[PDB]
């Protein structure tokens, strides 16, 4: 299988994204993550291979960082999620990626997820240009999503799946 972790500050929607990827309904059973939670899903990649995604959904709360840190190692893909209205959550992305890289040398693809795009654009606290510029400087990709819109979750996992299939 392919180890994928979701990291990012508390409340950005990591668990909502994972539940949407796993289940085809409205999401409703979500509380803050403490210990990392595991799920697996087998998917057909564009090259026709079946890939098993081994997914760990980790805690964003600051007091639980010493749990989340124990899940970095041996990750092949990472989704780093932030909330477009939560400026601190965006500033935190740099440090999430920095910390992952201190602890893990195996990641092949880091995808920054700008989440909660359903919120009115005039309430966003980060611009598309800032997001693109950040990623251009930090050897990572970006995508825009809303946990409540399955089309955006299918898309962001599709990008991750395509990259895993290149390994
Ligand atoms: N408007 C909006 N709210 C969202 C979206 N995704 C998640 N939320 C809400 O944000 C809150 C936090 O979502 P979670 O999925 O628990 O966030 P998390 O990143 O897993 O948080 P931690 O486990 O504490 O790190 C919930 O009330 C969600 O319903 C989204 O795309 N748009
Ligand atoms: Mg969570």
Curated annotation (Swiss-Prot):
Could you tell me the Gene Ontology terms of the biological process aspect for this record?
protein transport
Q: Does the keyword S-adenosyl-L-methionine apply?
A: no
GO CC, sorted alphabetically, is: host cell plasma membrane; membrane
Record GO terms (molecular function): GTP binding; GTPase activity
Kindly list the places in or outside the cell where this protein is found, as annotated in its UniProt entry. Answer: Host cell membrane
KW Membrane (keyword) present: yes
Origin: domain of life: Viruses
Q: Where along this sequence does the record place binding of GTP? A: 8-15, 57-61, 115-118
Query: Which stretch carries the motif Effector region?
Result: 30-38
Q: How the protein sits in the membrane?
A: Lipid-anchor
Location, primary (coarse class): host cell
Keywords tagged on the record: GTP-binding, Host cell membrane, Host membrane, Lipoprotein, Membrane, Methylation, Nucleotide-binding, Prenylation, Protein transport, Transport
Q: What does this protein do?
A: May be involved in protein transport.
Q: Which family does it belong to?
A: Belongs to the small GTPase superfamily. Rab family.
**Protein name, as recorded:** Probable Rab-related GTPase
| Species this protein is from | Acanthamoeba polyphaga mimivirus (APMV)
Q: What stretch of the whole protein does this chain cover?
A: 13 to 179 of 215
